[PDB]
Amino acid sequence: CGLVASNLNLKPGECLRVRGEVAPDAKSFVLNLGKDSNNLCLHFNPRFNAHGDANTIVCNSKDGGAWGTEQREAVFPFQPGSVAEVCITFDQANLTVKLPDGYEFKFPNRLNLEAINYMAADGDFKIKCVAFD
């Protein structure tokens, strides 16, 4: 397991910037956001080739230790052996993951927490920089 950050006081509107390195042999990587490891309002999992998925982003929530229903997208703006930057924010309705080029993924806010307190990276993704602004 990779970088774990807690006591982030990320309130609605505030923006979490993460820059990291995608491994050359990347099958998938994971960015987890929420209250703690059992309460995730966003499980952001780009799968190059993993768990039956190829070049597909799988988003989900985890509520009280229980996974929710997976949501899949068409576009896949990630490539192995490269640098990936995401800007993440949320409001009462959705979590939004923005990519520099203009890509924008919305995931429904299923947990409705006051803040994002927890971030964890996993899989083939080496976090290089985290910024709160």
Ligand X SMILES: CO[C@@H]1O[C@H](C(=O)O)[C@@H](O[C@@H]2O[C@H](CO)[C@H](O)[C@H](O)[C@H]2O)[C@H](O)[C@H]1NC(C)=O
Residues in the annotated binding site for a beta-D-galactoside:
43-47, 51, 60, 67-70
Which of a second copy, ligand X, none interacts with 89 (beta carbon under 5 to 8 A by kind)? none
70 interface partner picked from a second copy, ligand X, none, CB below 5 to 8 A per type: ligand X
CA 33 to each of CA 52, 82, 86, 101, 124: distance values in angstroms, whole numbers, following the listed order: 24, 22, 13, 22, 17
User: Where along the sequence are the contacts to a second copy (CB under 8 A)?
Assistant: 1-8, 127-133
We find the least distance from the C-beta atom of residue 131 to a second copy, in angstroms, to be 5
Q: In residues, how long is the chain?
A: 133
Distance CA 46, CA 118 (A): 19
Tokens 């803040």 locate to 115
Task: Report helix, strand or coil for 83.
Answer: strand
List the x/- string, 30-69, binding to ligand X by CB under 6 A: -------------x-x-----xxx----x-x------x--
At residue 3, what is the residue type? L
Which residues sit at the interface with ligand X, rule CB under 6 A?
43, 45, 51-53, 58, 60, 67, 70
